[PDB]
Amino acid sequence: GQIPLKEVTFARLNDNVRETFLKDMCRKYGEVEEVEILLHPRTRKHLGLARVLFTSTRGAKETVKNLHLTSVMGNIIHAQLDIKGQQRMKYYELIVNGSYTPQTVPT
Predict the structure, then answer these.
(1) CATH number for the domain including 21?
(2) Are residues 49 and 13 in contact, defined by beta-carbon separation less than 8 angstroms?
(3) Where does the protein end up?
């Protein structure tokens, strides 16, 4: 990467996986600085999307290694490194404006 890859984008999160769960879970894999869940602009419901910022690139990479395609609360997580929420924002747009749901967004 051309800059430090410290941030992970999650998609297809079960709607019970909110900020406290995310932080507790991701602390197993690296030191977590911040967690954020994205909500629908109108309903304020969970889009299955989240941002988790780590202190080190090692924490972001370990998180991706261990959680991508892992089932958490009965849904298979998508987890990838993301710069400036490029992919995360596309997924937001596809679910909110497009025809997709949180569990069917194409990644």
Answers:
(1) 3.30.70.330
(2) yes
(3) Nucleus speckle; Chromosome; Cytoplasm
